[PDB]
Amino acid sequence: IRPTIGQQMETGDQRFGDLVFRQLAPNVWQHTSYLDMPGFGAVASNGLIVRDGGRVLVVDTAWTDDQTAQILNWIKQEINLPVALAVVTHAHQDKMGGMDALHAAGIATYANALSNQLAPQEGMVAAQHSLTFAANGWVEPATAPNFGPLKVFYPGPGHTSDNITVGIDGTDIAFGGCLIKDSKAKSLGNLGDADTEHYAASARAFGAAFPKASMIVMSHSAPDSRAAITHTARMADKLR
Ligand SMILES: [Cl-]
User: Fold this and answer.
1) In this structure, is the dihedral angle defined by the CA atoms of residues 160, 19, 9 and 78, taken in order, positive or negative?
2) Distance from Cα 213 to the centre of ligand 1, integer Å
3) Angle of helix 227-237 relative to helix 199-209, nearest 10 degrees?
4) In order of start, what are the domains of the chain with their CATH numbers?
5) What order of strands is seen across the sheet that includes strand 165-168?
6) DSSP codes joined into one string, 122-187
7) Which residues are annotated as part of the binding site for Zn(2+)?
8) 190 CA distance to ligand 1 middle (Å)
């Protein structure tokens, strides 16, 4: 962990406990946590913290409960607003590994219904609430009450069958999670759970759902431009 965190850090990064925070916009921070995958080394996973009026919204947990509890501490001391809800973008450890910590803190948690149905078989704890989606991919508003600037969109199966994505109203930022890879990536990373036929279209759907967004946030790379989308789709075309 320690060597790779040092190599990864750039000028705007801030360290707290085991976690790295970078401010992306006036009310949006990227949280980064690391897991040592033996054979592979240390792997970063990015999520978001969003301040919306008098409350905080979290997109994705850290890899573990203890790291997630730390994110909550950093919020309590650096922002000092209550965390109203968390949204997790699919049933994998990088996004849902810290669920028990959120529930211990009394934080309302939301995921795709399908993420919650898959969570037990993926070794994850389900979120308390289930999001559903229309045929056009947009979240059904009654399943996502009081989400403020968070615009939740299900682009279809790609990285996983359940992957969801989030735009932040009032910013240039859209979060592709593990679906989108950066613009110079040599591969699509972990395709173990991937839908090869639909991935390209899903990546393109994410792109089209947030057509203005110029800062694409993803799980294992620094924020990139829209070329991350195009490039991810091009790589995915070679799968089908
Ligand atoms: Cl947009």
Assistant:
1) positive
2) 4
3) 160
4) 1-240 (3.60.15.10)
5) 150-153, 165-168, 173-177, 215-218, 221-224
6) TT-PPPSEEE-B-TTSBB-GGGSTT-TTEEEE---SSSSTT--EEEETTSSEEEEETS---TT-SS
7) 90, 92, 94, 159, 178, 220
8) 27
Kindly state the helix (H) or strand (E) to which residue 237 belongs, with its residue range. helix 227-237
Element (H, E) at 113: helix 113-118
| Distance (Å) of CA 19 to CA 75, 109, 115, 173, 177 | 12, 21, 25, 21, 18
Instruction: Say if strands 41-52 and 55-59 run parallel, antiparallel, or are unpaired.
Output: antiparallel
* Rounded-to-integer distance, Cα 185 and Cα 189, Å: 9
Residues forming beta bridges with residue 231, ordered by sequence position: none
Helix (H, G, I), strand (E, B) or coil at 99: helix
70's tokens:
């730390």
This structure's resolution (angstroms)?
Answer: 2.0
